Write a protein that binds this ligand. Structure first.
Ligand SMILES: C[C@@H](CNS(C)(=O)=O)c1ccc(-c2ccc([C@@H](C)CNS(C)(=O)=O)cc2)cc1
Ligand SMILES: N[C@@H](CCC(=O)O)C(=O)O
Ligand SMILES: N[C@@H](CCC(=O)O)C(=O)O
Ligand SMILES: [Cl-]
Lengths: 263, 256
């Protein structure tokens, strides 16, 4: 039928999507800025559609409840028909691929470790062999599922500890994880994606560090409901943007160009 | 069902002839990362398969004149093979004619020098002429330079395409040999995965310099609209999540 405005679900997560200074004076898409805002604009341009950015209601990436088998987060928006497309740092995973489509990845990352500087930890190994320094992950996302599902010894041991720790080591948002690392005098380390880790490492007060190698290797993709007519074009747009070097530029713009911890 | 025809390419350590292969037969002739991968994929998708080395020994490019596709890509496009399991780069032009799974490995274009060569970056290469440099024929690296609007890469392209003698090579091994036999006067542009594998092998006389010039992935390819596509993609994701892709990389990139 006639062209319709495309509903883009996304998540407030720096530096992917952030409230512009003066957002209280702005409306619609103008309220926001960031890597995924820029990406959304480029994708819409290359696929020839109009769109409306909408922050996911429950503020989550997406997990399926093991009881009700209901999906929440951005994945839920797509599965239940609330949004037409998701443009966010949304990790490509098997369980998600089974219910939604993903474009080829637009960004690579791996699970990694964030510490307050000087913390005596340099690996997942180290974390698992001690109990003084607590550690956890984001709720309702791909990192928690990674530990829950892992059959690798060190990671299995970390999960056994995490899932029962008290008080809870899990946080509802990345910002909550960061604050907890920053305020815990070295007694909390945070497991998050290297992209977010690296972004925070360049933010004031420059008191956090990525340590160790990545625990795994994967990517973010743009998601659409299964069998959506947008999928193909969006995949091509991502490949074109990648090959033009636009994704590389966008990353430097939002991570490094105006980093706050020196050159 | 049918025996799935797998096209692939002799490229270490992805696919290599085993020692004594001449008395061996069929799939047992070969070993390497993609050989193991093919076995895992087949097991997870429930098919039997026959590994075959691509006839012209190429990855895949479209002729600008004829617009015919060669290499593994051509074999998919013209129905000679059902699936390609090789270090085949996901690209826009290819994706327009065949299907790719989500990537099973990451890589970027990179620079290989003979140790001691006074070069640290692509920019260095482009600002001089004592040291010649080139790429593989009929693959994504050559197209990369052909299409780049980025100044440094565009300058390298301009030099490489008119250089005499030719700086382009038919196989990765000929590029590596060329770097080794050229007394520092030839540098080779190739994917970081292959660069790093070679760097760890004797005679340990080559080196990767600079960062990767780009960032991309290898994918498993099927003819456009193949029924095999979906299952293979779920297989790659499961293998990735189970840590198996990481294990295979550690095994084949285990001299120096
Ligand atoms: C820079 C962009 C370019 N993306 S593109 C489509 O041009 O290739 C990029 C992002 C991610 C990767 C990448 C490659 C391989 C792997 C496997 C280890 C896992 N693969 S998966 C889909 O299950 O996460 C993960 C991520 C490569 C490139
Ligand atoms: N990108 C992740 C969220 C971040 C994390 O889990 O660390 C996801 O899609 O679930
Ligand atoms: N992986 C490349 C071949 C090697 C190269 O181009 O450097 C391709 O699929 O074309
Ligand atoms: Cl032999």
């Amino acid at each position: 039928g006639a062209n319709k405005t495309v509903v883009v679900t996304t998540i407030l997560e720096s530096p992917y999507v952030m409230m512009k200074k003066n957002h209280e004076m702005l409306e619609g898409n103008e309220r926001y800025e960031g890597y995924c805002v820029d990406l959304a604009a480029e994708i819409a341009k290359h696929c020839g559609f109009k769109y409306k950015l909408t922050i996911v209601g429950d503020g989550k990436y997406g997990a399926r409840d093991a009881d009700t088998k209901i999906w929440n987060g951005m994945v839920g928006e797509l599965v239940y028909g609330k949004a037409d497309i998701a443009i966010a740092p949304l990790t490509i995973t098997l369980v998600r691929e089974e219910v939604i489509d993903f474009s080829k990845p637009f960004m690579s990352l791996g699970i990694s470790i964030m510490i307050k500087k000087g913390t005596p930890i340099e690996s997942a190994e180290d974390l698992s062999k001690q109990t003084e320094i607590a550690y956890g992950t984001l709720d309702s996302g791909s990192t928690k599922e990674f530990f829950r599902r892992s059959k690798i010894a060190v990671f299995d041991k970390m999960w056994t500890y995490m899932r029962s720790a008290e008080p809870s080591v899990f946080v509802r948002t990345t910002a909550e994880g960061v604050a907890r690392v920053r305020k815990s005098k070295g007694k909390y380390a945070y497991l998050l994606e290297s992209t977010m880790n690296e972004y925070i490492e360049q933010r004031k007060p420059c008191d956090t560090m990525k340590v160790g190698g990545n625990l795994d290797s994967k990517g973010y993709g743009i998601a659409t409901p299964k069998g959506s007519s947008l999928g193909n074009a969006v995949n091509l747009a991502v490949l074109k943007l990648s090959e033009q070097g636009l994704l590389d530029k966008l990353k430097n713009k939002w991570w490094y160009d105006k980093g706050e911890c020196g050159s």
